[PDB]
Amino acid sequence: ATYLIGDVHGCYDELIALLHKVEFTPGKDTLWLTGDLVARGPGSLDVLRYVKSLGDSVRLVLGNHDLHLLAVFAGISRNKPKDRLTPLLEAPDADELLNWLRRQPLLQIDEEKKLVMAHAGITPQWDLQTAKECARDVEAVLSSDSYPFFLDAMYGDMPNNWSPELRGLGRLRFITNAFTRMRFCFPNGQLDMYSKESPEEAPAPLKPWFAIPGPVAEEYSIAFGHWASLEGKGTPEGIYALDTGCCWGGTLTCLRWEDKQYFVQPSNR
Numbered sequence: 001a002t003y004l005i006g007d008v009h010g011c012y013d014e015l016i017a018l019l020h021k022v023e024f025t026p027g028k029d030t031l032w033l034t035g036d037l038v039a040r041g042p043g044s045l046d047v048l049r050y051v052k053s054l055g056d057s058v059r060l061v062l063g064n065h066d067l068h069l070l071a072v073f074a075g076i077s078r079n080k081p082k083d084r085l086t087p088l089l090e091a092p093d094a095d096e097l098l099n100w101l102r103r104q105p106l107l108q109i110d111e112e113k114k115l116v117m118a119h120a121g122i123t124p125q126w127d128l129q130t131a132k133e134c135a136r137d138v139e140a141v142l143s144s145d146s147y148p149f150f151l152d153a154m155y156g157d158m159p160n161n162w163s164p165e166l167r168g169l170g171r172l173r174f175i176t177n178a179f180t181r182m183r184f185c186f187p188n189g190q191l192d193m194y195s196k197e198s199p200e201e202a203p204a205p206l207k208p209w210f211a212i213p214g215p216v217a218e219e220y221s222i223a224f225g226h227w228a229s230l231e232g233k234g235t236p237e238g239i240y241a242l243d244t245g246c247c248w249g250g251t252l253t254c255l256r257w258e259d260k261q262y263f264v265q266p267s268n269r
């Protein structure tokens with residue numbers, strides 16, 4: 001069976017309870033994770049250890065907090081106490097865990113299930129071949145010996161319009177923002193990087209990226225996390241928002257793909 005779970009954010013206990021609820025069995029089942037495995041919750045270290053241990057039984061995409069963790073680890077960004085990352089950073093296996101984490105994809109594709117996963121979704125300005133190429137570009141940087149310079153470069157909110165003619169840092173920054181930070185678009189598909197509220201609270205003419213017909217969404221289902229104030233609701237058919245804010249005291253949600261059956265685990269507050 002195929003299980004998809006949204007942003008875990010270090011909520012290891014809830015993760016394990018949800019997986020026991022479905023009798024998740026490595027070797028017979030596969031787990032898809034939308035990213036943001038770490039930060040806010042208390043068990044980032046345990047989460048990373050367990051997910052890494054699953055090997056081929058897990059298909060992960062990196063989110064924005066995974067990338068921030070990598071930036072703290074390389075000395076690029078400052079650690080926030082609120083992120084609760086110090087046990088993970090001071091772990092004796094920190095190097096192993098994080099060199100594994102930076103080698104994971106930004107994008108997961110399963111042709112037989114017609115299923116695409118990215119942390120934030122798929123911008124409507126992209127077709128599938130382009131999404132793939134951009135994922136491969138950023139992934140090559142992340143898994144190279146020079147990933148700290150990339151992490152330093154990734155911060156920024158422009159450019160917000162895609163073009164195959166984009167180059168260098170602007171290209172990397174747009175790819176990163178589209179995959180890990182996207183929520184609302186302008187009618188032409190151009191990215192907005194300031195509104196994090198629910199679709200009903202955003203001012204016109206902003207709409208969710210998925211309310212704009214895009215070539216990928218026309219042929220594929222798309223699962224994603226990241227956008228907690230969506231609360232998993234309001235998506236069109238074929239769009240699955242899996243982040244229900246477990247680390248914020250909401251719930252951790254698991255979707256079984258074969259029957260589209262939802263299983264939910266309350267936050268441990």
Ligand SMILES: [Mn+2]
Nearest residue numbers: 036063064226
């Ligand atoms: Mn996120």
Ligand SMILES: [Mn+2]
Nearest residue numbers: 007036226227
């Ligand atoms: Mn998140």
